[PDB]
């Protein structure tokens with residue numbers, strides 16, 4: 001049992017750290033519209049889409065009752081971009097940097113909960 005405001009307080013700074021990354025977070029700030037991006041085969045590969053705005057809205061309303069529910073949403077977001085994008089692409093590289101950032105922020109947060 002974590003009460004919702006404690007979870008928000010502990011985890012929100014970890015989402016803030018990602019969101020503030022410029023230019024790396026930009027492709028992750030909103031859902032991927034595959035037709036407007038000219039990538040009409042996106043949902044045939046990526047089965048469960050996730051992005052920072054979805055993660056923020058769920059965290060804002062208290063949908064995450066356990067820390068693991070939040071960590072898993074963030075790794076789903078990362079894993080989706082690593083799957084669809086080539087290892088030599090701008091987007092792939094942006095993804096990995098964000099993850100490096102996330103791991104620094106998240107480790108101590110999990111160690112003291």
Ligand SMILES: COc1ccn2c(C(C)=O)cc(C(=O)Nc3cccc(-c4cnn(C)c4)c3F)c2c1
Pocket residue numbers: 022026027029
């Ligand atoms: C980092 O420094 C600044 C300084 C000022 N702004 C402002 C405004 C309007 O002044 C919006 C933003 C801002 O970044 N808004 C925002 C919010 C969500 C998504 C984007 C965005 C832009 N391109 N993409 C792909 C996503 C976006 F630009 C911003 C950032």
